[PDB]
Design an enzyme around this catalytic site. Structure first.
Site, PDB file in Angstrom:
ATOM      1  N   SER A 124     -52.195   7.632 -57.573  1.00 42.28           N
ATOM      2  CA  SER A 124     -51.249   6.920 -58.487  1.00 42.28           C
ATOM      3  C   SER A 124     -51.782   6.810 -59.909  1.00 42.28           C
ATOM      4  O   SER A 124     -52.958   6.536 -60.060  1.00 42.28           O
ATOM      5  CB  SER A 124     -51.006   5.479 -57.974  1.00 42.28           C
ATOM      6  OG  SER A 124     -50.027   5.591 -56.930  1.00 42.28           O
ATOM      7  N   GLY A 125     -50.952   7.041 -60.902  1.00 41.71           N
ATOM      8  CA  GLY A 125     -51.403   6.949 -62.301  1.00 41.71           C
ATOM      9  C   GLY A 125     -51.910   8.246 -62.807  1.00 41.71           C
ATOM     10  O   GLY A 125     -51.942   8.433 -64.007  1.00 41.71           O
ATOM     11  N   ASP A 132     -42.231   3.530 -64.501  1.00 44.03           N
ATOM     12  CA  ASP A 132     -43.599   3.289 -63.969  1.00 44.03           C
ATOM     13  C   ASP A 132     -44.629   4.007 -64.893  1.00 44.03           C
ATOM     14  O   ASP A 132     -45.160   5.052 -64.560  1.00 44.03           O
ATOM     15  CB  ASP A 132     -43.676   3.847 -62.576  1.00 44.03           C
ATOM     16  CG  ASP A 132     -44.945   3.381 -61.855  1.00 44.03           C
ATOM     17  OD1 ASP A 132     -45.659   2.493 -62.306  1.00 44.03           O
ATOM     18  OD2 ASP A 132     -45.233   3.918 -60.794  1.00 44.03           O
ATOM     19  N   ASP A 135     -49.488  17.165 -50.777  1.00 48.48           N
ATOM     20  CA  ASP A 135     -48.795  16.110 -51.583  1.00 48.48           C
ATOM     21  C   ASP A 135     -49.821  15.212 -52.258  1.00 48.48           C
ATOM     22  O   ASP A 135     -51.004  15.328 -51.956  1.00 48.48           O
ATOM     23  CB  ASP A 135     -47.981  15.254 -50.622  1.00 48.48           C
ATOM     24  CG  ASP A 135     -46.973  14.307 -51.264  1.00 48.48           C
ATOM     25  OD1 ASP A 135     -46.458  13.459 -50.543  1.00 48.48           O
ATOM     26  OD2 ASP A 135     -46.686  14.401 -52.449  1.00 48.48           O
ATOM     27  N   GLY A 138     -53.983   6.174 -54.224  1.00 44.66           N
ATOM     28  CA  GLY A 138     -55.307   6.459 -54.843  1.00 44.66           C
ATOM     29  C   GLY A 138     -55.100   7.496 -55.940  1.00 44.66           C
ATOM     30  O   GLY A 138     -55.870   7.569 -56.879  1.00 44.66           O
ATOM     31  N   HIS A 196     -47.685   0.388 -62.033  1.00 45.31           N
ATOM     32  CA  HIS A 196     -48.073  -0.293 -60.782  1.00 45.31           C
ATOM     33  C   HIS A 196     -49.574  -0.267 -60.565  1.00 45.31           C
ATOM     34  O   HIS A 196     -50.037  -0.836 -59.594  1.00 45.31           O
ATOM     35  CB  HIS A 196     -47.295   0.352 -59.598  1.00 45.31           C
ATOM     36  CG  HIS A 196     -47.777   1.646 -58.925  1.00 45.31           C
ATOM     37  ND1 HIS A 196     -47.290   2.860 -59.021  1.00 45.31           N
ATOM     38  CD2 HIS A 196     -48.825   1.720 -58.033  1.00 45.31           C
ATOM     39  CE1 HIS A 196     -47.991   3.645 -58.232  1.00 45.31           C
ATOM     40  NE2 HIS A 196     -48.934   2.964 -57.617  1.00 45.31           N
ATOM     41  N   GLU A 252     -70.513  11.455 -67.452  1.00 46.37           N
ATOM     42  CA  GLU A 252     -69.657  10.262 -67.337  1.00 46.37           C
ATOM     43  C   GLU A 252     -69.711   9.370 -68.572  1.00 46.37           C
ATOM     44  O   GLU A 252     -70.738   9.285 -69.227  1.00 46.37           O
ATOM     45  CB  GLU A 252     -70.081   9.299 -66.208  1.00 46.37           C
ATOM     46  CG  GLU A 252     -69.829   9.901 -64.841  1.00 46.37           C
ATOM     47  CD  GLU A 252     -71.069  10.599 -64.247  1.00 46.37           C
ATOM     48  OE1 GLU A 252     -72.006  10.997 -64.902  1.00 46.37           O
ATOM     49  OE2 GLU A 252     -71.132  10.771 -63.051  1.00 46.37           O
ATOM     50  N   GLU A 260     -65.839  12.301 -64.845  1.00 46.36           N
ATOM     51  CA  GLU A 260     -66.252  12.178 -63.445  1.00 46.36           C
ATOM     52  C   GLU A 260     -65.881  13.362 -62.569  1.00 46.36           C
ATOM     53  O   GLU A 260     -64.936  14.079 -62.842  1.00 46.36           O
ATOM     54  CB  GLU A 260     -65.561  10.993 -62.747  1.00 46.36           C
ATOM     55  CG  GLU A 260     -66.017   9.618 -63.173  1.00 46.36           C
ATOM     56  CD  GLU A 260     -67.303   9.255 -62.467  1.00 46.36           C
ATOM     57  OE1 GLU A 260     -67.715   8.112 -62.367  1.00 46.36           O
ATOM     58  OE2 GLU A 260     -67.929  10.167 -61.996  1.00 46.36           O
TER      59      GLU A 260
HETATM   60  C1  LIG Z   1     -49.943   1.218 -49.954  1.00 47.43           C
HETATM   61  C2  LIG Z   1     -49.864   1.945 -51.298  1.00 47.43           C
HETATM   62  C3  LIG Z   1     -50.322   1.271 -52.399  1.00 47.43           C
HETATM   63  C4  LIG Z   1     -50.256   1.864 -53.637  1.00 47.43           C
HETATM   64 BR1  LIG Z   1     -50.933   0.794 -55.084  1.00 47.43          BR
HETATM   65  C5  LIG Z   1     -49.740   3.138 -53.844  1.00 47.43           C
HETATM   66  O1  LIG Z   1     -49.686   3.671 -55.134  1.00 47.43           O
HETATM   67  C6  LIG Z   1     -49.270   3.838 -52.717  1.00 47.43           C
HETATM   68  C7  LIG Z   1     -48.744   5.120 -52.874  1.00 47.43           C
HETATM   69  N1  LIG Z   1     -48.150   5.916 -51.905  1.00 47.43           N
HETATM   70  C8  LIG Z   1     -47.920   7.108 -52.523  1.00 47.43           C
HETATM   71  C9  LIG Z   1     -47.343   8.271 -52.032  1.00 47.43           C
HETATM   72  C10 LIG Z   1     -47.235   9.368 -52.903  1.00 47.43           C
HETATM   73  C11 LIG Z   1     -46.678  10.583 -52.474  1.00 47.43           C
HETATM   74  N2  LIG Z   1     -46.570  11.565 -53.348  1.00 47.43           N
HETATM   75  N3  LIG Z   1     -46.284  10.715 -51.224  1.00 47.43           N
HETATM   76  C12 LIG Z   1     -47.711   9.227 -54.236  1.00 47.43           C
HETATM   77  C13 LIG Z   1     -48.278   8.038 -54.684  1.00 47.43           C
HETATM   78  C14 LIG Z   1     -48.373   7.001 -53.803  1.00 47.43           C
HETATM   79  N4  LIG Z   1     -48.856   5.813 -53.980  1.00 47.43           N
HETATM   80  C15 LIG Z   1     -49.336   3.234 -51.443  1.00 47.43           C
HETATM   81 CA   LIG Z   2     -70.011  10.435 -60.940  1.00 48.44          CA
END
Ligand SMILES: Cc1cc(Br)c([O-])c(-c2nc3cc(C(N)=[NH2+])ccc3[nH]2)c1
Ligand SMILES: [Ca+2]
Ligand SMILES: [Cl-]
Length: 223
Positions: A177-178, A84, A171, A175, A40, A62, A52
């Protein structure tokens, strides 16, 4: 990362930032020319930023390398986020050293209770957005499958696992993600999704990397 701490510059050498004029996702370096991230997080125009700590200041260490191709898993379902995972091939190999290093893929899956390190430059507020300049870390345990399925009934597939705290407060978040979930030195998870961030009884859900090691090896070997 909500409720985490400042990692310390270059203490997570396999962490990368995916950038398109701003940081939008994290990733893990698994060898000098390949990064593993979440499907995603796919988009074109990705520049991979290695070594970084502060993503808004060039502090030294970097390495900015453009992605040559991104391979989203063929069975990725954007509605359920099942499979994913994405592989990114770098235009040139990165120079590995103590500040930029790859992380090992696992040989077996991890058990519930395993303590792991999750890191990233994602949101640090559960109610609002505060994005950090430096890398944040969080130590979190893998939860049992029954607690995970009880928290997200009907949404957990065998390619996912939950990690975190049911009391809320700590948690991963948007941001992050990945990015990596490392346990005993092996990459066991990829930050994928969750309901809100750090909410009670809504732990984070991660892509279960041990289910994809042959797919990653075969795909890298043929590209
Ligand atoms: C609005 C939006 C857009 C993206 Br792209 C995301 O990956 C997410 C996201 N929510 C998340 C919540 C979590 C969690 N551990 N609670 C982890 C990754 C997430 N990624 C939300
Ligand atoms: Ca930097
Ligand atoms: Cl179920």
């Amino acid at each position: 990362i909500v409720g985490g701490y400042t990692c310390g510059a270059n203490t997570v050498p396999y962490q990368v930032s995916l950038n398109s004029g701003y940081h939008f996702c994290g990733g893990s370096l698994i060898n000098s020319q390949w990064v593993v991230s979440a499907a995603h997080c796919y988009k074109s125009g990705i520049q991979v930023r290695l070594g970084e700590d502060n993503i808004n200041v060039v502090e030294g260490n970097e390495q900015f390398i453009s992605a040559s191709k991104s391979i989203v898993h063929p069975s990725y379902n954007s509605n359920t986020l099942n499979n994913d995972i994405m592989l990114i091939k770098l235009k040139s190999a990165a120079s590995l050293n103590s500040r930029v290093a790859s992380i090992s893929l696992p040989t077996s899956c991890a058990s519930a209770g395993t303590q792991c390190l999750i890191s990233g430059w994602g949101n640090t507020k559960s109610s609002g957005t505060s994005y950090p300049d430096v890398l944040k870390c969080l130590k979190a345990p893998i939860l049992s499958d029954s607690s995970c399925k009880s928290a997200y009934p009907g949404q957990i597939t065998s390619n996912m696992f939950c990690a975190g705290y049911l009391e809320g407060g700590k948690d991963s978040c948007q941001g992050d993600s990945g990015g990596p979930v490392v346990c005993s030195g092996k990459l066991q998870g990829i930050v994928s999704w969750g309901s809100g961030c750090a909410q009670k009884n809504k732990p984070g859900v991660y892509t279960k990397v041990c289910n994809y090691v042959s797919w990653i090896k075969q795909t890298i070997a043929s590209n």
